[PDB]
Structures are given as structure tokens and as C-alpha cells.
């Protein structure tokens, strides 16, 4: 029916069907400023075709090895892409680009369900739509993110098992807002009570799972060049249900926060929103409690990049934030303890110090005094412990210089804020951690396998995870395909599901491995980048195939590199320059004490010294958890993709999308199915589409298919006989299609002709007659002319008058 609640979801079947397609002509040709292009095949000088561009209607040179198969029109804006006859890098960029432009942003691809970034709100998430998606099987209803979730849940209940929902994707792809809509959904279909009260709901865990996101987005988000509320950190957020199938409790778990952000901010950027909500005078009573003067322009740790953000009201987000803290039960001591700790960072950026006398002095205590008050420590004990630290051993008393000090003041903030954030996840984790375990549904939202101009230790951590998380899908796929084949008595014994992923993975995490190395080279004083690299190269350079050296940099505006890694999405060149620093983040093993022995309940908790920790070692450790977990789940995959650098709706950009599609998973996901047997009809639906391809063979289903196939001299290593479905090797349905068509026309022409023959044969019996008839006429008119012109007659019929 026509329920205008599918407007931005469905796509009219009839009104869509309302062209002519030449398989032998229509194809796709690479394009420098559009990725691909429609065209018509003209000629072939072997391994080099020539074709016309439907667009500007012209001609160009294309190696017959670069053209890619084009699907007929009957696969226009096709709900599920794992069904198109020709599934290629371009055939997809079309259905994705085609759909997205009509308004649609929800397209499946087997397990996947890609979400393109609409740059405008839509009717699809309203409660009424939700009733429509309730329980319905993915097929029986337009692609959409609600289906991905409603299914998980339905499966959790049915299958009785941990359903996970990893959402990956580039920066500004929509994952953050999506993880919400999946969360703002699950709630709507697994809430407390909607049947049997006035003084009932006195808070609501829903209100909390929700009200939490603000306190976080406040410290985890920020404005970057692709400035969404950039989830500058990754978050795994499980959801727990009860033995009736209802939301019980939840919890957080985060990965890699941009600590390097607290103290620096690139061109046209800021710091986590919070610093801009404090200096907002949205809540004056507190300006004193923190000791700040409501103008960002002032504070050095935040007046590096810009300050303002179009849609963000730093002075409103604070108000809500506070409320947010309250609706969570944060005690004033706490809520305030946090701000003290937060404001105290701004002040650190406001502490400057004063050729030969190497050791530096301070240039006033003002802020140092404010940093001490805010942290409850001796301003003297602090400034003194900084300029002249006393790290353990008969400990020594190392000295610091003007630079060495500014460097630690920053490490202070960087390491506080990070300590801070952690504590915050823990605390909320505490709230929502209602005491009650049936099962659960997790959701992942970390960056994606992103390759850039300049790739360093950060890109490394990230691509590594996705590397690990990709290997996840591969395996998932594995088990799944196998089940199919076996379920169809067609079982094949292929194996290597997660391929060289292991190579490049272990070559990073395993013993001799990179980080494995990196983590040791951090505990060796006089060791610089050169020190690193040589060992990095020795150990593996030349000794492995996944570790090589930089290639052809034909992209002029590229960045340096040292080594290069063979990651699935592409061999990513890297640049160790820094790592030793970036990994072992310092701090005064001396000043930490103070902060641990502060008088403020919080700060103290923050720096309690493991009594009776490198970025990499932590992450790797917290990653096995995630993985160990994910494998104890039932995956679902939501692939998000940004369409352009302009936040403009309907504006695609092939370089980007493709770019994404490769490291996205939809590609390396497609090719992993290639080696198996993709496209597969059912021996009936089949026997009805090609029974015209072997007419003389037919005297059911698997009987005829077994005959039309054989009847076509079909190559064995090309198809396999299922027990309900006929399996086909990638693109072989494309051949039986073209073949099918040429054959239909031929058969119709035969008929047509036979008709013409029919007629003529009939008009034959007459031309034989008429001929004679005209044989007379013509001849008998000659006689009439000859005779009426003679003499013996003009002299014979000249007497009749008297006869």
C-alpha cells in the first residue's frame, strides 16, 4: 500500500519500471573526476577498446582490462546489492550513488547495511516507522538501520546469544549518530512497562543511558576539520537484557582518546567541547569554583585553533551538561570535583617560566597557585617538584630546562585529562551498572581503516584495530558460507578464511612484532627514531612479505614514509618519527605523588599510585578483550560513508566513496565471496529463466536445470548443484544472461519469419492464378491492337456493314 512513511525508504516498483540495454555495448570506464563512467562499446584493437561516453557523448582510450560489467536497468536502486548480476567496484558505486540521490541512504550488501551520510534530518526515525519495522525480516521491508537492530534483538531472543553490532567507517560518516538511533531504538522495543501507573516511575535507566552521552560527548568530542562532534575516541557499548527480553542495564568501554588534543589544536579547530562550556559563564556561581574568566580567547590551551562552532551553543551545552550530570546522580562534590580538575588544566596552559644557567625558574606563581588550589597541593611543592624533579632509583634529582618544563606541564594536562576521562567512563559505567545477566547486544563505534597522505603511530593503532576487526568479518563469513554449502549437500573444503590478515596482524602484535618491539625501545634512554627504525628494519625488513619499502608516490601532495605495511585495504606507508615519544607519555614520577596525595577526593583517586602502561600495551590488552568478546557474539555490520567534503546532501564524490568502499569492508568482503560460489538461483526459479536456453532438452526443477546446464556444455568448475538452490560462479549468470537474450531474439525472429513464410505460401496459389489472368489481358490487347491495325481486317470488317 501507500503509507508515506517509506517516502525516504521505499522506491516505487511500477513508477520505476515505467530502458533499452545492450550487454554487448554498455559498460563502465574509469574516470579521473567521477571514478567511473557509462559508455557504449564500438570496436576492439585487441586488449584496447574504444567507447563512447553517454554523458558528453564522445570517445576515449580504455584497456579492455579496465572496463567493468554493467547491470541492466532492472537493478536500479536495488535494495540488496548481493543480488545484482554484475557486482563490481563500479556496479556498486552506481546503486549507492543512484539510491542516495533519490533520498535513500539505506542499502544492504549481504551482511552489510551501508549508511550514507544524509546531510539533513529525515521522517524515517519516527515512532510510526518503528511499528512497521517491528519483527519484520530484513527482506520483507526496505533496507534501513532499524532493521539491523530489530533483527539483532529478535535473534538474541531466538538464538539465545550475544549479538554484537560493530559500526565502522571514516570520520564524519554517521556512526556516532547511528549508534544512537540503534540505542534510541532498542529502548523503544524493550522498555520497562507500557501496560500496567500514576505514582509509578519516580531516574529511568533509559533517561540515563541517554543522559550519559552528553557528559561524554562533552569530553570525548570536538571540532575538527570534519568537525562533527568528532568522537575523538572509540566506544564499545554493550546493552543487557532480562529473561523476558527487556532492557536491564548497560555499560561503556572506550578506545584511544586523542590525549594529544588537550594541549594543542590545529588550524580552525578547538578542544573537547567542555573547555568551551566552562569559559561560557552559563553557570556563573561556578566561575569562582574553577576560577575562570568566561572568554576562551584567553586560555592558551584552547586559543590555538578557533573557538566558535556554528550549531554549538557552548553556553547551553553546559547547562544541559550539568543537568546531564545531575540526572546521573553526580554528587556536588563530584560534579564540582570534575570542573575543578577541568579548569585546572586551562591554568596549566597559563603558567610560563623564566641562557647559561640552564635550569629554568618560573615567571610568577599566579596560575601555579591556582593549579595548586584547584588540585589541593602545595603551589610551592608543585612548581618546585616540576622545575627540579626527584625520580626514583638512591634516587637522583634530574634537572629540567625552559623547554623541558613546558613539556611536562603539558604532559600533566594530557595525563590528567586522560586519567579524568577514564574515571568518567567508569563512574557512568557505575550508574547504568544497575545490579541484576541474561544476555546482551554490543555496539562498536571506532574509526575505520583510514589511509592518509601522512600515516603515523595514530593511523597505526587504528588500522591495526580495524585490521583485527576486519579479520572478524572474514571469519564470520567463513562459518556462514560453509553452513550454506553443507546445508545444500554441496559442501566444498576451502579453508583460509582470515587470510594474510594474520600475517600483517601478528607482524604487529606478536612477540618479535612491531609494537611488540616499539614497546621495548621505549625503555632505553638515549634511543632516538634512528635507534628505533634500524631495529625495526633489521628484525623484519627483508625478512617478511608484509613489511616492505615505500612505492610510487605519484600523488605530489603526499607525505613522507619509512616502512610500508600490507594491510588489506592497501599497503599503508608509515612514519615512525615520534613513536618513541608518542608511546611512552612521560610525567614527573615525582609530581604524580603530590596529585596522589592531594586533599581533593577526586584528584587523589585519579593518581593513586599502583602501590604494593604504554599506550600500545594498554590498547592491545583492551583489544583482546573486545575481540574475545566480539567472537562470543553474533555480528551485524553497519558500514557508514561520508559523501563529500561539503556537508551537502545529494552530493556524491566517487574518489571518496570508492576510497571508503575499499577500506569499508564491502569490497574485501565481496572478493572473499568471489572464490566461493556467489549468485545462486533456486532450481525452480532457475528452470524458468533459462528453459529457453536448451529447448530440445526438456522432456522438475533440479531435473531441468541439470539438463539445461548439461545442454549448454556447462563447465563443471563453474557451478555446483545445491539441493534447493543452483550455485553459480561470480559473473557466470551474466554470461547465461547475454546468451539468454541473443537466444530469445533469435527464436522470435525464427517465429516472425515463419509467419511471413506462412502468408506468402498462401498468396502463392494466387500469383500462379493471376499470372495467367494477366497472361491473357496483355496478349489479348496486343491482338486487339495488331488486328485493329491490319488490312485484311480493315478490309474484312469493312464489309460486315453489308453482311
Amino acid at each position: 500500500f501507500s503509507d508515506p512513511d517509506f517516502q525516504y525508504l521505499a522506491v516505487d516498483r511500477k513508477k520505476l519500471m515505467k530502458a533499452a540495454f545492450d550487454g554487448k555495448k554498455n559498460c563502465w570506464v574509469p574516470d579521473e573526476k567521477e571514478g567511473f563512467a557509462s559508455a557504449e562499446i564500438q570496436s576492439s584493437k585487441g586488449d584496447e577498446i574504444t567507447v563512447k561516453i553517454v554523458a558528453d557523448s564522445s570517445t576515449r582510450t580504455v584497456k579492455k582490462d579496465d572496463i567493468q560489467s554493467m547491470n541492466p536497468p532492472k537493478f536500479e536502486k536495488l535494495e540488496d546489492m548481493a543480488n545484482m548480476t554484475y557486482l563490481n567496484e563500479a556496479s556498486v558505486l552506481y546503486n549507492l550513488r543512484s539510491r542516495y540521490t533519490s533520498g535513500l541512504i539505506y542499502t544492504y550488501s549481504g551482511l552489510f547495511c551501508i549508511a550514507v551520510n544524509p546531510y539533513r534530518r529525515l521522517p524515517i526515525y519516527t515512532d510510526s516507522v518503528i511499528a512497521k519495522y517491528r519483527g519484520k525480516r530484513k527482506t520483507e521491508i526496505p533496507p534501513h538501520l532499524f532493521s539491523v537492530a530489530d533483527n539483532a534483538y529478535q535473534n538474541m531472543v531466538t538464538d539465545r546469544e550475544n549479538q554484537s553490532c560493530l559500526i565502522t567507517g571514516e570520520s564524519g560518516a554517521g556512526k556516532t549518530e547511528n549508534t544512537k538511533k540503534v540505542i534510541m531504538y532498542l529502548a523503544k522495543v524493550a522498555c520497562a512497562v507500557k501496560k500496567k501507573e500514576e505514582a509509578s516511575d519516580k531516574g529511568s535507566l533509559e533517561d540515563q543511558i541517554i543522559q550519559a552521552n552528553p557528559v561524554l560527548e562533552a569530553y570525548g568530542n570536538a571540532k575538527t576539520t570534519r568537525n562533527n562532534n568528532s568522537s575523538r575516541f572509540g566506544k564499545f557499548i554493550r546493552i543487557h537484557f532480562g529473561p523476558t527480553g527487556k532492557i536491564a542495564g548497560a555499560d561503556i568501554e572506550t578506545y584511544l582518546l586523542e590525549k594529544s588534543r588537550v594541549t594543542y589544536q590545529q588550524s580552525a579547530e578547538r578542544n573537547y567541547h567542555i573547555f568551551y562550556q566552562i569559559c561560557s559563564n552559563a553557570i556563573p556561581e561556578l566561575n569562582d569554583v574553577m576560577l575562570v574568566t568566561p572568554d576562551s580567547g584567553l586560555y592558551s590551551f584552547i586559543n590555538q585553533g578557533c573557538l566558535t562552532v556554528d550549531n554549538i551553543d557552548d553556553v547551553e551545552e553546559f547547562k544541559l551538561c550539568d543537568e546531564a550530570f545531575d540526572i546521573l546522580g553526580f554528587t556536588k562534590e563530584e560534579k564540582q570535583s570534575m570542573f575543578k580538575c577541568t579548569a585546572s588544566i586551562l591554568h596549566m596552559g597559563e603558567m610560563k617560566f623564566k641562557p647559561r644557567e640552564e635550569q629554568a625558574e618560573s615567571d610568577g606563581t599566579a596560575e601555579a597557585e591556582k593549579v595548586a588550589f584547584l588540585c589541593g597541593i602545595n603551589a610551592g611543592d608543585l612548581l618546585k617538584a616540576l622545575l627540579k624533579p626527584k625520580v626514583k632509583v638512591e634516587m637522583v634529582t634530574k634537572g629540567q630546562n625552559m623547554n623541558q618544563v613546558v613539556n611536562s606541564v603539558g604532559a600533566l594536562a594530557k595525563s590528567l585529562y586522560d586519567r579524568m576521562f577514564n574515571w568518567l567512563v567508569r563512574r557512568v559505567n557505575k550508574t547504568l551498572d544497575t545490579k541484576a545477566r541474561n544476555y546482551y547486544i554490543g555496539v562498536l563505534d571506532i574509526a575505520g581503516f583510514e589511509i592518509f597522505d601522512f600515516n603515523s603511530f595514530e593511523q597505526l593503532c587504528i588500522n591495526y584495530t580495524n585490521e583485527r576487526l576486519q579479520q572478524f568479518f572474514n571469519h564470520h563469513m567463513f562459518i556462514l558460507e560453509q553452513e550454506e554449502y553443507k546445508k545444500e549437500g554441496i559442501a566444498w573444503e576451502f579453508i583460509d578464511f582470515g587470510m594474510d590478515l594474520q600475517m600483517c596482524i601478528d607482524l604487529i602484535e606478536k612477540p618479535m612484532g612491531i609494537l611488540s618491539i616499539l614497546e621495548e625501545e621505549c625503555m632505553f634512554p638515549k634511543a632516538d627514531d634512528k635507534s628505533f627504525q634500524d631495529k625495526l628494519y633489521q628484525n623484519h625488513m627483508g625478512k617478511n612479505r608484509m613489511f616492505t619499502k615505500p612505492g610510487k608516490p605519484t600523488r605530489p601532495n603526499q607525505g613522507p614514509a619509512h616502512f610500508e605495511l600490507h594491510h588489506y585495504a592497501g599497503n599503508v606507508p608509515y612514519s615512525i618519527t615520534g613513536w618513541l615519544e608518542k608511546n611512552k607519555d612521560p610525567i614527573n614520577e615525582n609530581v604524580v605523588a603530590l596529585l596522589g596525595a592531594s586533599k581533593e577526593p577526586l584528584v587523589a583517586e585519579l593518581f593513586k599510585a599502583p602501590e604494593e602502561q604504554t599506550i600500545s600495551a594498554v590498547h592491545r590488552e583492551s583489544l583482546n578483550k573486545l575481540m574475545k568478546n566480539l567472537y562470543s557474539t553474533h555480528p551485524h555490520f553497519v558500514r557508514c560513508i561520508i559523501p563529500n567534503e561539503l556537508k551537502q546532501p545529494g552530493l556524491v564524490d566517487a574518489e571518496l566513496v570508492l576510497h571508503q568502499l575499499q577500506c569499508n569492508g564491502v569490497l574485501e568482503g565481496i572478493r572473499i565471496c568471489r572464490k566461493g560460489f556467489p549468485s545462486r538461483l533456486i532450481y525452480s526459479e532457475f528452470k524458468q529463466r533459462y528453459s529457453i536456453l536448451a529447448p530440445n532438452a526438456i522432456p522438475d526443477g533440479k531435473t531441468v536445470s541439470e539438463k539445461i546446464l548439461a545442454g549448454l556444455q556447462m563447465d563443471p568448475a563453474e557451478y555446483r548443484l545445491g539441493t534447493t538452490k543452483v550455485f553459480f560462479k561470480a559473473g557466470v549468470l551474466g554470461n547465461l544472461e547475454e546468451m539468454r537474450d541473443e537466444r530469445l531474439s533469435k527464436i522470435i525472429s525464427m517465429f516472425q519469419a515463419h509467419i511471413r513464410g506462412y502468408l506468402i505460401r498462401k498468396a502463392y496459389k494466387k500469383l500462379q492464378d493471376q499470372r495467367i489472368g494477366l497472361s491473357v489481358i496483355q496478349r489479348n490487347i496486343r491482338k486487339w491492337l495488331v488486328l485493329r491495325n491490319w488490312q485484311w481486317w480493315k478490309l474484312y470488317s469493312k464489309v460486315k456493314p453489308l453482311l
Binding site: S691, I692, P695, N696, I698, L744, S745, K746, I747, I748, S749, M750, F751, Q752, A753, H754, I755, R756, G757, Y758, L759, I760, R761, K762, Y764, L767, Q768, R771
Partner: protein
């Protein structure tokens, strides 16, 4: 490999056509296949087109001695069988109970292959006599056989 009688019967056609456009030992190329059908063959524009056939009336003529080969050529051609036909119509049969939208039939016939002129169509439908029942569709199966039985039955 024409028998002297088969080739003997071939003369006869060529002779009646040489006449209907001018008794002069020749036959407008544009009849090549209309002459071929008269003997039993079931050519296709292309078939005929590929052996010397022309498009318009009066662009070439054919002495029988050269017209002959033109014919033997079209004897080694595809002359589609019942099963071929059927399956071609079957693809249009939506339900499977053997029936087609009167338009379809005409549509198919005039829109598929290259052509068949509506006139030519009305001629065969009226000729063969395939009429759509009170609904507006028809059993093409019992029609094909007609177009195949030929003007004169058994």
C-alpha cells in the same frame, strides 16, 4: 546438394517471379527470400540479407543461375522448432497457464526481432484466426502450431 527435381521445382518459383516484375530471366533482389519461402524455406531478413538480398525494390536483379546459390545458402539456416517458439512465448506467460495479453502478442511481434508490420500481423491473426476469448488474452500454444501448419492444413 539439390536433387534435379528439387532444383527443378526451384526453377518454377523463380520463373513465376521473373514474370511478376518483368519476364526477362531476372528477379528483383528484393524478392530473393519471398521466392525462398514459396519453396518451403523460412528465411530471416538477415539470412536473406547476407546472401545478396537487397532492401529496396530496384537496386539489383538476379539471373537464376546466381539466384540459385543465394537459395542453397538459406537452406543451411536455423528454422526454429516448436520448443524454441513455445519457450519464447512462455517467457511472456506470467502465470504459466498458457495465455497472453493480446497487446503482448502484437507488441512482441511488432517490437521484437526487428519487425513485422501491424498490417502483416492483422493479416496472420485474421488469416490463422487466433481470437482472444471474452477476457482479452489467448492461448498462444494453439496459435504457434497454426503459424507452423501453414495456410493449407491436412
Amino acid at each position: 546438394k539439390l536433387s534435379q527435381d528439387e532444383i527443378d521445382d526451384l526453377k518454377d518459383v523463380f520463373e513465376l517471379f521473373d514474370f511478376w516484375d518483368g519476364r526477362d530471366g531476372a528477379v528483383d533482389a528484393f524478392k530473393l527470400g519471398d521466392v525462398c519461402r514459396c519453396l518451403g524455406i523460412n528465411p530471416r531478413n538477415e539470412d536473406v540479407f547476407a546472401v545478396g538480398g537487397t532492401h529496396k525494390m530496384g537496386e539489383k536483379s538476379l539471373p537464376f543461375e546466381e539466384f540459385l546459390p543465394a537459395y542453397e545458402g538459406l537452406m543451411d539456416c536455423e528454422q526454429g522448432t516448436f520448443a524454441d517458439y513455445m519457450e519464447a512465448f512462455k517467457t511472456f506467460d506470467r502465470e504459466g497457464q498458457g495465455f497472453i495479453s493480446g497487446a503482448e502478442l502484437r507488441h512482441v511481434l511488432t517490437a521484437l526481432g526487428e519487425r513485422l508490420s501491424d498490417e502483416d500481423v492483422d493479416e496472420i491473426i485474421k488469416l490463422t484466426d487466433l481470437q482472444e476469448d471474452l477476457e482479452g488474452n489467448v492461448k498462444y500454444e494453439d496459435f504457434v502450431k497454426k503459424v507452423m501448419a501453414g495456410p493449407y492444413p491436412d
